[PDB]
Amino acid sequence: EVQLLESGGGLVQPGGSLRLSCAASGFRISDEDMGWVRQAPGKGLEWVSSIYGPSGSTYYADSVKGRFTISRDNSKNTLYLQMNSLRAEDTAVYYCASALEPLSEPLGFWGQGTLVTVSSGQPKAAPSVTLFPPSSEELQANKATLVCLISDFYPGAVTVAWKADSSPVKAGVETTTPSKQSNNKYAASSYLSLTPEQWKSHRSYSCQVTHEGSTVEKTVAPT
Amino acid sequence: EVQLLESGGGLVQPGGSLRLSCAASGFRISDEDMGWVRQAPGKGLEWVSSIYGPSGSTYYADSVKGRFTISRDNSKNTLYLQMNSLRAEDTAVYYCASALEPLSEPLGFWGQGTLVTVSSGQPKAAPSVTLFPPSSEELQANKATLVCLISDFYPGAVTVAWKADSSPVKAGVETTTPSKQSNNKYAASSYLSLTPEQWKSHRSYSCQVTHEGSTVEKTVAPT
Amino acid sequence: QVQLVESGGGLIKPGGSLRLSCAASGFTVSYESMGWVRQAPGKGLEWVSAISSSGGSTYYADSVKGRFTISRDNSKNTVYLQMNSLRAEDTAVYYCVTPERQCKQSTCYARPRYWGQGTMVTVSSASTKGPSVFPLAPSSKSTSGGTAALGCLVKDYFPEPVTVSWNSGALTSGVHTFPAVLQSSGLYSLSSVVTVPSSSLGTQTYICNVNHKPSNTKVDKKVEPK
Amino acid sequence: QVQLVESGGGLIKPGGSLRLSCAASGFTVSYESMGWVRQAPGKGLEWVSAISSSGGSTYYADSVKGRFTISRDNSKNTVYLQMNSLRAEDTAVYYCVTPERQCKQSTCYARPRYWGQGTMVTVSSASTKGPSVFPLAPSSKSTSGGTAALGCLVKDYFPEPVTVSWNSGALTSGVHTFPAVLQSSGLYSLSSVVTVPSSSLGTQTYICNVNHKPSNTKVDKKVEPK
C-alpha cells in the first residue's frame, strides 16, 4: 500500500521559518497533484497550497502567498512546503494531501500530520511523566489499567509508545489529544487496558512519550 | 470550452507508417493523461496507447507495442501517435482521448476521430457526386429536400458541407456514414431538409463533399 | 483488450425504459472501473456514466442524471446501465469501454481493458408508415454517350427495411440504393439512383419499385425529364 | 478559505441515523465539488464521500457505501451527508472540506475553498452509569522535600461530565484532572493527580471527590500508600 509520511515542523517565533517534508512511497510525486492542508480548532481543514502537475502551476491561499513555497524533489520522491515569515495565525496541524482519484480503492491519501506552532512568549517545555501500575482494588475487580499521565509540555504535541517488557504493544491503548493547561502548557493521558493475566505474566511495562522526539518514559513492574 | 482537434491519418499499404496529431486547446497536454482509442465495426472502442503524466510511463496494447509510439510536444501543445509497421488489423477510426476527471463538467473529452486504413489491393478513389434539387411533386407537397449522393470513394471517409448561396447551413442536414459497395468502394448520402420558402428565396444551394480533403461539389438553383 | 458480451438495446418510444448490460462469457473479470460511451449519429463520442471497481461510486453526465442508473453485479461479472424516461436525445450507439484513470501504478498500467460490441438504442415516437416516393429527375445536360443519372427519393417511412428495384428488376446495371438515414422525425429515408444511357432517355421509361412490406406498400414511380 | 455553517452531529446508538449539513450563511456559494472528511480519535484523516458540482456524481468510501448518502440543494447553498445504520467505526469528527481536483485551469486554481467547523459524531451503545474510582497510590520513593504524586482513576462512566476535587476543595495546589478518553466500550474514563509534600504522607489523608451527576453519584476515595 502507498504511504505518505511527514517530517519537519516544530516551534518557531514570529518571523521564523520551517520546512515540511512528505515522503512518497509506492508512487512518484510528479504525476499526482499534491497539496497541504492545515488543521486548527474552530478552523476545520483549510487548503493552504497545492501543486498541479508538471507545468509547475501552483495554488496558494491568499494568507500564505508570498510566504510559503510548494515544491517537489523527484530525485528523492518528496513533497516540500517551505514556510517563511510565519505568523501566529499559521499555528496548526499540517497534513500532506494528494489528488483525490475518486474511482480508486480509497479516494484520497493523507500524511500523518505534524504540528507547526508559532508563538513568542512561550519557550520549549519537556513533559513531566508519571506512570501508575494497576491498583490492587482494580486487579481484585478482575481488570487492570496502566495509567500514564503527561503534563507541562510545550508545544502541545506528543506521541506515546507502550511496551510490554521490550516488544511494542498493540491493543487497549487509549491516549487523549493534548489539552491546554492553566499555565498555558499542555497535558495528555495514556491508558493501557490489560487483563490481570498479562500484567502478572510480564517482567515490566513501560510508557514511552516523545515530544520533539524527546524519549521520556517510566517503567513499572508487579514486583 | 476546451477542445481536442485531430489531424493526420489516411490510407497506407501494409508496412507503411502514419502519425496522428491531437491539438489541445484550453489546457496543456502534460498535466493530463491522454490516450488513443480505435473504433472498428464489431470491435467497439479499444484503448491502444495512453501516456501517464510527466514520468513518461506509457501503456500500449499488446498488438501495438514495438510499433506505435505515444508522445507529447508541449511547445506545440499536441499529443502525437506514431504508427509504424502497420497491418490490416490496425484499420479503424482513431480517437484522441484524455483523462476522465469524473467530478468535472463533462467527464471525458474526445477528439473528432480520423480514419486510418491499411490495405494493399485497393487504391485511392475520388467520389462521384450528383446533387438533386427538390422535385416538383415534393414542392407541391409543401416540403423540399435536397439530395446529395456520393459513391465510389476509397477509403470510406467523407465530410459533407452544405451551403446556401455562400454561407454554410446549420439545420436539416442528415448524412449517413459511409457504407461499402459491391466493388468494395464506399457510398454515402446527404439530405438537406428545407421549407419551400428558403429554396425559392436563395440564388443557389451547394453540397460540398471532401474526401482526403478533396473538395468535390455540385450546385443547384431553382432556375 | 478482451471482449464482454453486450446486450439489451433496441427501439422504444419517448418516456420508455431499456436496460443494457455487459457480462463475461466463460471467465471471471478482474474487477475494475467501468464506463459507458455513446455516439449519436453524425456526432462525436461522450461519456454517459462510470462506476468504480466496488460499485459504490457512480458518475453521470448532466444530460443523463436521474434518468439513467449504472450498477454492477461482480458475482455475475456483469455491469448494467438502466435507462429510464428515454428521450430522442438518447438515440445513439452505446459502448462498454473501460475508463482510463490516473494510474501512477504498475497495476493500473497493465490492467485488462474490456470492451463491448456496441448496441443501438433508438427512441422514436413514430411507427408503421408507408413511404413517400419522389422522382429525382434527370438534368438538362445529357450527352449522347452515357452520363444520365436519375433516382427516386423514398421519404418518411417506418420502419426498416425497404426494397428498391428498377423496372421490376429488368434494369440492374449501375443502381446504388443507398442506406437509409434516421431524421429528427423518427422516420427513415433513402434514395436509389441509376445512371443510364441518355439515348434511351425519352424513349425508354424508368420506374423504381419501392416495397415497404412492414406497412404492406410499394410504389413504382417514373423518372421522366421535365 | 471561506466558512460554511456545519450542523447535525451528536450521540446515537449503533444502527441509528444522523444527518450532517453545511450551508452558506448570508451569501451564495459558487457551486463546485464538495467532500466530507472524518478523523477517528487517535487516527488519521480519511475521505468518506464526495459529490460533484451539479450533484449527480457521488463517491463513497468502501466502509461507508450503502449506509451513507451525500446530496446537495444548490438552491439552498447546502450539502448534506445522511448517515444511516451507524456503527462504532463511524465515531469521528466530520469536516466539510472542498476537494482538490486535477485542475488544469485558471478557474480550478483560484476557486473558493469552503470549510466546515467540524462536528463530532459519537456512536455508543452505553448510557447513564456511575464511575468506578480506583486509587493511584504513591510510590515506594518519597523524598522528604516534595516529590509525591498520587491520583485516582475514574473508569467506565457515562456520560460526560465528571467533577473532580481533592479533600472537598481544601487541597487545590498542583492538581491535574485530565480530559476524559472514549474507549472501545463506549464509556468515558479519566484520572486526576495531585503532587504533594511527602512529609505529610502518612499523616495527612487525601480523598478525591468524583461527582457524576448525570447518574447522581460521587465517590470520595483515599490514596494511601501500600
Residue numbers in the entry:
A (entry chain A), B (entry chain A): 1 to 223
C (entry chain B), D (entry chain B): 1 to 226
Quote the original article.
Recently, Shi et al. proposed a novel antibody format where two such soluble VH domains are used to replace the VH and VL of a traditional IgG through engraftment onto the CH1 and CL domains of each Fab arm. Additionally, since these molecules were symmetrically constructed using autonomous VH domains, no special cognate chain pairing was required.
One of the best performing single VH domains, Gr3, showed greater than 90% monomeric purity by SEC, high Tms indictive of thermostability and a sub-nM binding affinity for its target, Her2. For example, IgGs and Fabs with transgenic mouse-derived 1F3 in the VH1 position or the phage-derived Hel4 and DOM1h-131-203 in the VH2 position showed yields greater than 25 mg/L and over 90% purity. More specifically, with its framework tryptophan no longer surface exposed, HEL4 may display a more attractive interaction interface for other VH domains including Gr3. This observation suggests that although VH domains grafted onto the IgG scaffold do not chain pair as do traditional VH and VL domains, paired VH domains do interact, as shown in Figure 6, and the VH–VH interface plays an important stabilizing role for the molecule. However, the VH:VH dimer alone (in absence of CH1/CL) shows good alignment with VH:VL Fv domains (root mean square deviation, R.M.S.D, of structures tested = ~1–2 Å), indicating that while the orientations of the domains differ, the structure of the domains themselves do not.
